[PDB]
Design an enzyme around this catalytic site. Sequence first.
Site, PDB file in Angstrom:
ATOM      1  N   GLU A 227      34.466 -22.250 -27.397  1.00 20.41           N
ATOM      2  CA  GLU A 227      33.671 -22.205 -26.355  1.00 20.41           C
ATOM      3  C   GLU A 227      32.041 -21.846 -27.533  1.00 20.41           C
ATOM      4  O   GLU A 227      32.061 -20.034 -25.717  1.00 20.41           O
ATOM      5  CB  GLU A 227      33.642 -22.045 -24.919  1.00 20.41           C
TER       6      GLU A 227
ATOM      7  N   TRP B  94      37.583 -28.087 -11.788  1.00 22.06           N
ATOM      8  CA  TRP B  94      36.252 -28.109 -11.441  1.00 22.06           C
ATOM      9  C   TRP B  94      36.079 -29.127 -11.205  1.00 22.06           C
ATOM     10  O   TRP B  94      34.727 -29.346 -10.895  1.00 22.06           O
ATOM     11  CB  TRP B  94      35.478 -27.021 -12.537  1.00 22.06           C
TER      12      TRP B  94
ATOM     13  N   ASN C  91      34.820 -15.353 -16.526  1.00 25.23           N
ATOM     14  CA  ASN C  91      35.457 -16.914 -17.247  1.00 25.23           C
ATOM     15  C   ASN C  91      33.784 -16.783 -17.492  1.00 25.23           C
ATOM     16  O   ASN C  91      34.205 -17.042 -19.026  1.00 25.23           O
ATOM     17  CB  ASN C  91      35.725 -17.614 -15.900  1.00 25.23           C
TER      18      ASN C  91
ATOM     19  N   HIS D  17      30.956 -18.219 -24.641  1.00 25.45           N
ATOM     20  CA  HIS D  17      30.712 -19.147 -23.634  1.00 25.45           C
ATOM     21  C   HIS D  17      28.976 -18.557 -22.869  1.00 25.45           C
ATOM     22  O   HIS D  17      29.060 -19.927 -22.217  1.00 25.45           O
ATOM     23  CB  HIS D  17      31.985 -19.296 -22.889  1.00 25.45           C
TER      24      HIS D  17
ATOM     25  N   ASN E 216      33.139 -11.908 -10.355  1.00 26.12           N
ATOM     26  CA  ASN E 216      33.641 -12.063 -10.449  1.00 26.12           C
ATOM     27  C   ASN E 216      34.388 -13.565 -10.022  1.00 26.12           C
ATOM     28  O   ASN E 216      33.599 -14.880  -9.015  1.00 26.12           O
ATOM     29  CB  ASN E 216      35.074 -11.188  -9.932  1.00 26.12           C
TER      30      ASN E 216
ATOM     31  N   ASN F 234      46.309 -19.741 -14.455  1.00 26.92           N
ATOM     32  CA  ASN F 234      46.129 -20.577 -14.934  1.00 26.92           C
ATOM     33  C   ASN F 234      47.747 -21.478 -15.785  1.00 26.92           C
ATOM     34  O   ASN F 234      47.776 -22.090 -16.273  1.00 26.92           O
ATOM     35  CB  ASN F 234      45.014 -21.460 -15.835  1.00 26.92           C
TER      36      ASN F 234
ATOM     37  N   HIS G  32      42.204 -15.903 -26.835  1.00 25.42           N
ATOM     38  CA  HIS G  32      41.469 -17.267 -28.127  1.00 25.42           C
ATOM     39  C   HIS G  32      40.833 -16.259 -29.436  1.00 25.42           C
ATOM     40  O   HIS G  32      39.521 -15.828 -29.365  1.00 25.42           O
ATOM     41  CB  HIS G  32      39.403 -17.897 -27.979  1.00 25.42           C
TER      42      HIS G  32
ATOM     43  N   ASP H 106      38.420 -16.187 -21.896  1.00 23.30           N
ATOM     44  CA  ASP H 106      38.400 -16.786 -20.002  1.00 23.30           C
ATOM     45  C   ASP H 106      39.483 -15.613 -20.211  1.00 23.30           C
ATOM     46  O   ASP H 106      40.616 -16.193 -20.163  1.00 23.30           O
ATOM     47  CB  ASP H 106      38.125 -17.489 -19.887  1.00 23.30           C
TER      48      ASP H 106
ATOM     49  N   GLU I 250      42.991 -28.110 -25.945  1.00 21.11           N
ATOM     50  CA  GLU I 250      43.115 -27.603 -23.973  1.00 21.11           C
ATOM     51  C   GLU I 250      43.433 -29.226 -22.378  1.00 21.11           C
ATOM     52  O   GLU I 250      42.309 -29.432 -22.814  1.00 21.11           O
ATOM     53  CB  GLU I 250      42.429 -26.354 -23.657  1.00 21.11           C
ATOM     54  N   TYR I 251      44.622 -29.147 -22.144  1.00 22.41           N
ATOM     55  CA  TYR I 251      44.323 -30.121 -20.793  1.00 22.41           C
ATOM     56  C   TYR I 251      45.755 -30.058 -20.173  1.00 22.41           C
ATOM     57  O   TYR I 251      46.354 -28.696 -20.437  1.00 22.41           O
ATOM     58  CB  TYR I 251      44.904 -31.223 -21.464  1.00 22.41           C
ATOM     59  N   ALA I 252      45.591 -30.290 -18.970  1.00 23.79           N
ATOM     60  CA  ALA I 252      46.602 -30.386 -17.776  1.00 23.79           C
ATOM     61  C   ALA I 252      46.897 -28.857 -17.391  1.00 23.79           C
ATOM     62  O   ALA I 252      46.996 -28.193 -17.400  1.00 23.79           O
ATOM     63  CB  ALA I 252      48.231 -30.618 -18.438  1.00 23.79           C
ATOM     64  N   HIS I 253      45.355 -28.867 -16.687  1.00 23.98           N
ATOM     65  CA  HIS I 253      45.210 -27.395 -16.255  1.00 23.98           C
ATOM     66  C   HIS I 253      46.603 -27.101 -14.932  1.00 23.98           C
ATOM     67  O   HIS I 253      45.649 -27.114 -13.930  1.00 23.98           O
ATOM     68  CB  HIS I 253      43.727 -27.114 -15.352  1.00 23.98           C
TER      69      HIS I 253
ATOM     70  N   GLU J   2      33.878 -16.534 -29.212  1.00 21.52           N
ATOM     71  CA  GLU J   2      33.533 -16.773 -28.173  1.00 21.52           C
ATOM     72  C   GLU J   2      32.332 -16.561 -27.709  1.00 21.52           C
ATOM     73  O   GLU J   2      32.182 -15.083 -26.894  1.00 21.52           O
ATOM     74  CB  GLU J   2      34.450 -17.555 -27.599  1.00 21.52           C
TER      75      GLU J   2
ATOM     76  N   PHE K 165      40.726 -17.647 -11.107  1.00 20.33           N
ATOM     77  CA  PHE K 165      40.546 -18.806 -12.321  1.00 20.33           C
ATOM     78  C   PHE K 165      41.176 -18.570 -13.586  1.00 20.33           C
ATOM     79  O   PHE K 165      41.684 -18.287 -14.274  1.00 20.33           O
ATOM     80  CB  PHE K 165      39.420 -18.956 -12.707  1.00 20.33           C
TER      81      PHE K 165
ATOM     82  N   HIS L 176      47.670 -16.648 -23.679  1.00 19.87           N
ATOM     83  CA  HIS L 176      46.681 -15.101 -23.488  1.00 19.87           C
ATOM     84  C   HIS L 176      47.900 -14.142 -23.861  1.00 19.87           C
ATOM     85  O   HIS L 176      49.320 -13.972 -23.126  1.00 19.87           O
ATOM     86  CB  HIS L 176      46.385 -15.459 -22.224  1.00 19.87           C
TER      87      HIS L 176
END
Lengths: 1011, 199
Positions: free
Chosen positions: A449, A987, A90, A406, A585, A592, A379, A189, A525-528, A404, A589, A345
């Site tokens: 990110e 998280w 991730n 991150h 790893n 999603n 992304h 990710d 990004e919202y509502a995982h 990215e 995750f 994705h």
Amino acid sequence: RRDWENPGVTQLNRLAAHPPFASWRNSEEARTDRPSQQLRSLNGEWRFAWFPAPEAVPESWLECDLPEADTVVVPSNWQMHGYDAPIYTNVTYPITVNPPFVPTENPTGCYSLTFNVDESWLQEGQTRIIFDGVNSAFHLWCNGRWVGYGQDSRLPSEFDLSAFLRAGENRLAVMVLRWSDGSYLEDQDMWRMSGIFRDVSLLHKPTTQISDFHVATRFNDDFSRAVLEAEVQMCGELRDYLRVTVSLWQGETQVASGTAPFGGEIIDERGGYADRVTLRLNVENPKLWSAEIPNLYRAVVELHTADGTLIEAEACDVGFREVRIENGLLLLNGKPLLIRGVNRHEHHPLHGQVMDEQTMVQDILLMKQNNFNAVRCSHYPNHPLWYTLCDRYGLYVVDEANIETHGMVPMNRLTDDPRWLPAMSERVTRMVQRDRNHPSVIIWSLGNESGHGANHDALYRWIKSVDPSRPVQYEGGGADTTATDIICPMYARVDEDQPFPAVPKWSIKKWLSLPGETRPLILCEYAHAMGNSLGGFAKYWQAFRQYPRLQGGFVWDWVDQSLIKYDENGNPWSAYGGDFGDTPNDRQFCMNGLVFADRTPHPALTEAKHQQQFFQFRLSGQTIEVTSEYLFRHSDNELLHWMVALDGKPLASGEVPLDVAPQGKQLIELPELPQPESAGQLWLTVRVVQPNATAWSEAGHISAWQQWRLAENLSVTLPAASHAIPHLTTSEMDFCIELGNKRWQFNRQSGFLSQMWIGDKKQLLTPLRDQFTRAPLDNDIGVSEATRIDPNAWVERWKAAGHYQAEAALLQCTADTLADAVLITTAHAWQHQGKTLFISRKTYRIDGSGQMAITVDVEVASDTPHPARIGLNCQLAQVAERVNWLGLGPQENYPDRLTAACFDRWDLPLSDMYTPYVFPSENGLRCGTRELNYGPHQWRGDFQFNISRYSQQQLMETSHRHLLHAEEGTWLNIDGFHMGIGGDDSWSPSVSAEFQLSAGRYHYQLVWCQK
Amino acid sequence: CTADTLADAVLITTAHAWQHQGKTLFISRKTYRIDGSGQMAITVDVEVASDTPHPARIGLNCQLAQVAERVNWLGLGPQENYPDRLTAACFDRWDLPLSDMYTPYVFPSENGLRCGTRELNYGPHQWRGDFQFNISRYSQQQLMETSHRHLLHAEEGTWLNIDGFHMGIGGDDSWSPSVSAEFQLSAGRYHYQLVWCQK
């Protein structure tokens, strides 16, 4: 030289980026988008070898392929063939953080293709090869001669093979490296894999070419007159007889046309471009493009001569729309957009990251049928056919650059360094040069990110300089940086604030109200929706609809990224990070999505559909206010079907055709509704049905629904005096109650209902006890593992307080016979390490009519963490095929996610009552249940039930759904009170205080009988 | 309304329903357990119709025959508080004169409610549980009829209102419904337990 370990070299002899080219030699073939024979597909059987390092590759491979090499299909990823282990991570980089150097152990894939080229291609024109995507870097050889080098992975790399190709047999050799310096910009990710995962094509152009073309649309305030500006760039010799024709077509009807010779307006003191020409076509009353009505035109650019002899033709799709920002609002065609987007994705169900047209079309159909009007290419830039299908079907596209970092500490280490400014530009500018002609693309994105650096600002305002027609956004740096016109935080909450140092995620309502802030807010990004998730989505959409500058967001994400493995018997099963030997790893995750890997919908998709409806309903008196949220289309393919049900029994119904203007209001007057004198609650349910079949929906598709409570009839009738009374017998260890056929047995040592008998059939495998714990959800666990424990996680607080470990102690268990009943009073308390967490007091009344009434009073300590559950637990001894229930359904719902489920009488198979989440957890709960029928048993009251073949203990121990084994009988969990699931992120604790079991005292009543 | 003797208690089960013009608004089911130690436990289950307006109150009402000078209570106080206005009151043991338990509003209305009360002592009587109580010399009927506080006359004994659930008072404005949905008695089913004893 090691070009993969140097950020200053991103390409060698690579051609410039451009919109997609088919190289037609006939304008009619371009207009209808017929396949062009100047474009050949090199997809097919290639020869492949694997090496641990590029230095281990023998040079004899440059002359001929090795006899030990295998045959693969291109496009593919070699991690799906056994040559490597795909790596899921991730945030942490899959390699040692030491830019720009990669490990010496760099996996190498050697691809080879033997083919033939027609001699007509070699005599005239330029022949080029296009790689739509190679992960990550690659070196190219044609007939043993080095051609070029490519570094980017999600944008096409084009090389000129005119001076390399020969008549007859030609061999192409590609050396692909798993890790490069560009992989430091590829920390998305997802599953890290590698190979030629996109199309390989061979294109033939004439000597003089159409090198590029830019098409833009300009409007007035009314959008009744339009100017199409088409700027055309050529390569080759400049001749005075060269002309261009730009033709616009709607179907078979030509709308406008324009022909001009080469030569542009004077721009500088030295003049203008002699190889460029701009055409201005006037269109009267154009059909605008939107996600509701995707009106498309065909634009054909023909480079020809003055005699009329066509040299070459290039065609594209043009949508007349204009996206801008005024007064802090994002407008498309003058109307404020409400984004119902989702993050996507590129994950094929079987072939990893290899995308075909079928999966694209299927994904688009499920998004449009579930009220999604936008999509985020996250992304990275996608397959160029994805954009075209989005223009055809009408989805807004946010095109995001493949940047990215991150894993950098700090996250802006590379984006603030000017040395990485060139390479990042090659990942941004070229993307624009590929996708500035698609009307589906409405918002450009710098990436995700990567912190905030000056390179982001520079590339941002570069995009502003070249393409002012689209707004451009970026998340990094706290989503308030100068590098965004559109505020796009990730996982910011509706009401509560989470102030991280120097990157605080304030609540969206407070964010909009900050001093000096003007820009609109669209959540990137919202509502995982990681597993059993998506609680509080109703709050998000209430905030979106109430606030004008809250214009929706993108749900993370569409599809689970799970890979298919096989067991000892060859049975396929979905797998996540750590199941392939990759270490370190981020274990589950990767999943999603709102749908499974095989595009099977999750129960959260129904909630997403209901919260994103384009029709809102308001019941007042007996009339219904129907408000459209469509902005450009009239309600021409919708009708309202209403129905009235008394406790799941239909009484009256009807169908009303809908005639609503865009963002307009319509009144529907219902007829005289029934007025029953029988007890029960009246429910009014309305559904919007499309009678005709759209390109994305079928005939009878339901796009919206709503339910209300009508007048209620409380029951005041009394039960008849049962002639028989239950016999109560007191033993030294048991209490036994007879009613003829039905025998209850309570154990005086444990204080619970030990056994139930109908005839001589036992009905309980385990006694009916209390339950205050559930199988922990993905939101409950968060980012806490066995090695690293997060004390803020709900599961760690539960197991630290001993909720999963507390033992029930019997305080009281008494029995006494009444006049026409037998009364059983029990009282327990759950204790851990001398601390009492819960106290349960139950009363069992066994009537002579047959019903057993259970009243449960639970006292919960305030200092202990709030329990996820307060209810009963037992294991029935009978497996029935059907489960009936009067309540909310028919899908899985929870206290914080139940607005989509309707109250009715639902009959479902038992296997349908279990949600097959890949990571096992609590699932299958049905809220608002008034009655539950299973086999001979009937339960009545107000409760939340889940019924399955797997115990909660098994769901807690087991980590994969394929390892679950059905237990004897049927596990039933009836709960008086249940805790919300959260879903703001995965998280942090995301459950709101109104959905937490925090009162301290709870009470619930059940009735258990035999129907 | 049934009664039956237990091993060490006497159990009284009652069930009523409130009706207006043939429409049932509320259904009350009470259980009175009289133990041999002296405590009387009352469990009350109330069903409220969804279509009728949400009641301002769900509780018990009685008029004691004794006027005591002091009122003791373990709960939130010592001032008047309500479900939507209670953040100022502290949880402690408060002893106050009876005249202090009545708020002298010029326009008579509901007043003197104390929320979060765990124990209430008045004269010889003790009430335990979790409840919202108001104790005064004026009935709610008198407070409804009377328009000025000086026209109020003290009645015989002492009027006590112990309520399992109480509705918020509002206060955003005084010409529109200002009570928020979280402070409205809108669940439909409510339950509360009391213990009545002589200390």
